[PDB]
Amino acid sequence: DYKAFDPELWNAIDAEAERQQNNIELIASENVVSKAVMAAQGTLLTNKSAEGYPGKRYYGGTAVIDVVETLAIERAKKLFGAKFANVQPHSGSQANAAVYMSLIQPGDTVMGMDLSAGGHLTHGAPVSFSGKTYNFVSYNVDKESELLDYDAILAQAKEVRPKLIVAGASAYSRIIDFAKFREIADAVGAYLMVDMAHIAGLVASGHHPSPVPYAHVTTTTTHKTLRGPRGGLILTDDEDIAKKLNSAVFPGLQGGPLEHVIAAKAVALKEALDPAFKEYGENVIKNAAAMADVFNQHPDFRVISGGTNNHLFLVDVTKVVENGKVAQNVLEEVNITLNKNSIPYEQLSPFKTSGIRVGSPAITSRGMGEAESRQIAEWMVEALENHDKPEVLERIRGDVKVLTDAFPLY
Amino acid sequence: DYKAFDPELWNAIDAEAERQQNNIELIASENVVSKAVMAAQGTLLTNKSAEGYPGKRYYGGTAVIDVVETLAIERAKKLFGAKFANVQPHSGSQANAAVYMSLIQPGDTVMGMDLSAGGHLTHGAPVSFSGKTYNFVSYNVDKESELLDYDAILAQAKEVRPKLIVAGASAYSRIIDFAKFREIADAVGAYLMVDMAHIAGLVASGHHPSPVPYAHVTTTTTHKTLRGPRGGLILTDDEDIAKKLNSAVFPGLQGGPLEHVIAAKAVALKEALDPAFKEYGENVIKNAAAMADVFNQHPDFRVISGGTNNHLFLVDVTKVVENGKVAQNVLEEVNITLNKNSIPYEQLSPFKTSGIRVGSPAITSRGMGEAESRQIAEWMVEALENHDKPEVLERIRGDVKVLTDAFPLY
Ligand SMILES: *Cc1c(COP(=O)(O)O)cnc(C)c1O
Ligand SMILES: *Cc1c(COP(=O)(O)O)cnc(C)c1O
């Protein structure tokens, strides 16, 4: 009994397993990985250091590690249709750090999505290494439509003359035209990086256009929609850039890779290669649409861009609670975690925001469908209309338990 | 069930457990973690995105995760004698990157140990962000004694006037005087960073003086001598440095921490707080000494600095095989993994080297003792003397096999 040595730690692990079961996870980044993905991270591959790349290791005894990493590498190439993959990045933050390091120089100018319109921290926030190391100039969505305007971007690009354009977002609901982003990049002589961390699973599933054929380099996380272990991944079709990327990940930015997590990457990528992953993607698309329909129909809420063609959507809540932070707290009391979130052309402080961000991938991996998704948005609408009224929140929390009980987690 | 879906990957994982049993691991960086450490990494805490810090998270649903991270922080503060601890770095390299971001500006001068006397890549290699981002100037050991010379280092520091001195090494056998390093830093108005990755276990066990009282900031891997999951850890007693370290790690450098690996850190730190960890420490010291003795007493080999007071030691092999690369290969042939290693004032090319590096932590962790340790060194001498005599190697493999059988890995 290894658990018996450390009850304080393993009682917390049980408490979290319980907490998850009794919690509706609507946070768009979140998912529920298979038992195989978890099992793989908990193997004795943690024991073995593999500084270097397959058949170019610093150390010996690395023959079987090369099989595991080469599987992961080959499975990502096959799934995403890329000539080159690096599976060693510890996180999406590090995968992004390696691409910047490979394509541009400290102080060089970079275009990323506005951080209220769907841009990521790592796409130029001044509190991120990304902001501090490079000159980031944001491109917005159109104010009226809340859509990417490829004409407006192209004209801004022509003035800013960036060395690099970043596309991909964590709060944009609509299909990105990657062909148009590359057309713009080519129009001004810049690289295109696509950070697809949010949509990588929808890309695996067929439901989002691939940026792989259009981006010079594509980064993603292996967690989020792709539903793998916590980590990062870099794809490219350019052999010269693959060489630079490999160098930047190690020994540029990282030391030894987490080969146990890389075994969980290989596993999860094989799961994404299965026809059942197409079904999952389909249900991610429907479940999010079902939830968003409910906010569309209700007069006191506006969905950003009018709806969604991916795993998530934002809602302006400001007609019903003071701000997004309030919205967020209220729903935690009914055992529904989402997150406050900026909306295009945000008026309020970044700590308050005008919006909530809903996502479908977690409830979808639990086995929930459109009925359940609609039900959960009605509950969100009731709880938020009745933020004042604890007797009301208390009834809803009891209904949430009925539904969580109904849909086990593992 | 779930392994049937992916036989290719789970057979490679069976292959690596086999290989690990049938191999004598003397790579000094390596260890054998407990079943609890692997188990904790294989739990559903990978599903919870926890950006931020305990009671200051971006997302709700994070109360239990706050218990698991605070366990790790508190266990690290207790074990190491530190007022502040950050358990979020994905690796030693990321831990180091966060400390540089916290204490110095890009282009500032840093002294670290030479990448040939025991310096790490992250201590100024031109191929690491360390060398690229900062002005690294390396300090050496005395040519004659192979010891750090605290008077020479002070003399160098007065000339180079660094913002930061890095102490700590990956190939140095002797007790470091952390008070002397701080005296030098204080003498020249420099911060002191100690990277104790290789010796964190022997510090935990009480067999190596703590740097914690003397370093402005201590970094380490949670793996290596401390026998934890692969990751990093930062320690300081300065509240204002702790605030900057925390910002640096997130959102400066990382995104979401690996809360499952943090759980495993928490397990490992409680393991190293146990009295049994002191015996592990004692046995690491005796076993490495036993192995060093054999190279000392043999005329054709020289141990660097004449021996060791920690877990590792270097041997000049060049009076027996052409270089350290050949030594590494011969020994792989008989199921002993170690690494070629630059020695002080290395004459040969980095790729070839004069030296081998032996460590006791891994065999110590498999329950081996002084007798076994001496046998392995005898076998290494025999094998190397008789390198191009396949008759002999075959018999040593057979012998090794008998010993690996005798000490099950798990
Ligand atoms: C191993 C090591 C590191 C880096 O750890 P990774 O987890 O490989 O990034 C840094 N410093 C020292 C002294 C080390 O031994
Ligand atoms: C989550 C995310 C990242 C960073 O991933 P971490 O593993 O948390 O470092 C980067 N970019 C995007 C778009 C993301 O969604």
Automatic annotation (TrEMBL), chains A, B:
- Pathway info: Amino-acid biosynthesis; glycine biosynthesis; glycine from L-serine: step 1/1; One-carbon metabolism; tetrahydrofolate interconversion
Q: Which GO terms describe its molecular function?
A: glycine hydroxymethyltransferase activity; pyridoxal phosphate binding
CDD domains linked to this entry = SHMT (cd00378)
Which residues are recorded as modified (N6-(pyridoxal phosphate)lysine)? 224
The record, for InterPro entries, names: PyrdxlP-dep_Trfase, PyrdxlP-dep_Trfase_major, PyrdxlP-dep_Trfase_small, Ser_HO-MeTrfase, Ser_HO-MeTrfase-like, Ser_HO-MeTrfase_PLP_BS, SHMT-like_dom
Q: GO cellular component terms?
A: cytosol
Cofactor dependence is on: pyridoxal 5'-phosphate
The superkingdom listed in its UniProt entry is Bacteria
Q: What is its EC number?
A: 2.1.2.1
Q: Which UniProt keywords apply?
A: Amino-acid biosynthesis, Cytoplasm, One-carbon metabolism, Pyridoxal phosphate, Transferase
Statement: the UniProt record of this protein carries the keyword Repeat: no
Amino-acid positions noted as binding (6S)-5,6,7,8-tetrahydrofolate in the UniProt annotation, renumbered to this chain: 115, 119-121, 239, 349-351
Give its localization: Cytoplasm
Subunit architecture: Homodimer.
Family affiliation:
Belongs to the SHMT family.
**What's the stated role of this polypeptide?**
Catalyzes the reversible interconversion of serine and glycine with tetrahydrofolate (THF) serving as the one-carbon carrier. This reaction serves as the major source of one-carbon groups required for the biosynthesis of purines, thymidylate, methionine, and other important biomolecules. Also exhibits THF-independent aldolase activity toward beta-hydroxyamino acids, producing glycine and aldehydes, via a retro-aldol mechanism. Thus, is able to catalyze the cleavage of L-allo-threonine.
What is the name of this protein?
Serine hydroxymethyltransferase
Name the source organism.
Streptococcus thermophilus
Q: Which gene encodes it?
A: glyA
